Amino acid sequence: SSVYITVELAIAVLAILGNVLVCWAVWLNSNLQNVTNYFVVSAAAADILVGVLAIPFAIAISTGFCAACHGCLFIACFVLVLTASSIFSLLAIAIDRYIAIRIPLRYNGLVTGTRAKGIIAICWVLSFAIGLTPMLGWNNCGQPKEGKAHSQGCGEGQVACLFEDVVPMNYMVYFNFFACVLVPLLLMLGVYLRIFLAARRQLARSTLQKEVHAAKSLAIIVGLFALCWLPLHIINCFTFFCPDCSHAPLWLMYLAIVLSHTNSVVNPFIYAYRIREFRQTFRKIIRSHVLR
Ligand SMILES: CCNC(=O)[C@H]1O[C@@H](n2cnc3c(N)nc(NCCc4ccc(CCC(=O)O)cc4)nc32)[C@H](O)[C@@H]1O
């Protein structure tokens, strides 16, 4: 429907603007050019690609255009790769924060500039590995829905391009949900809990205040991640566990897809926005750089 399209396009607009703003800030401000903010930048970059590429492809995938099955499958896989890199590089921020607060004596030695770039390379490789798996044969292209293609006015040699028609639900539940949503979530939760509880126990005051700040920033990332990603993936479980049941309605599918993309506007933007150094650099960019 047209409401889904517009909202989805508005999300794409917000995700580019905010995440360019994050990247711009690190580029200009010398005080922000540390290892931590490289994970912030990488995640922001992955978000820009979600806005420019993933979301327009996702709309098509969710509304339906005519295409060859493997071309239709390729576009779906592309959405998966880009949204996943968005997830993994955000997880890299959380892990960085764990090593910073809990193991400071090994932080600079362990999380070097070289290994930070290595970590981000691993994120993209995992994203391609997981995202493109259906291209290897774990897909529904062997049984094209020829009756649906007709109703959609698709030519022969083409199918109606719909995500769930080509990407199997067993892949989405057993592989994608586990590797991309559940594991990162639970990891980010475990990192948050440890920092949170350790900070409460001590409650010198400067290190403690930092620890509280980190906890609340990690709570927001985890809270929003779960809010944005769980609804869609939980729905995916329901479809998989009862494929005979009547499908979750179109409006619910759309809202859930929309929520998952909203993650790219809020993560890691709010994290950065909560660092006062970023917050003042943002104001500097708007007030001074663009306005004069
Ligand atoms: C790495 C993780 N990324 C993702 O999950 C990304 O993939 C996409 N997506 C993940 N599941 C899904 C998923 N079930 N359906 C779709 N679209 C198709 C929507 C749709 C479903 C069913 C029906 C028939 C309804 C009926 O019988 O009456 C019509 C449209 N996209 C997904 C999202 O864009 C997400 O951001």
Ligand SMILES: CCCCCCCC/C=C/CCCCCCCC(=O)OC[C@@H](O)CO
């Ligand atoms: C933390 C990451 C988790 C990794 C575990 C991933 C492995 C899980 C294994 C699941 C068993 C299912 C594999 C079954 C492979 C099925 C491939 C196929 O021929 O297509 C069937 C589909 O078209 C049906 O819709």
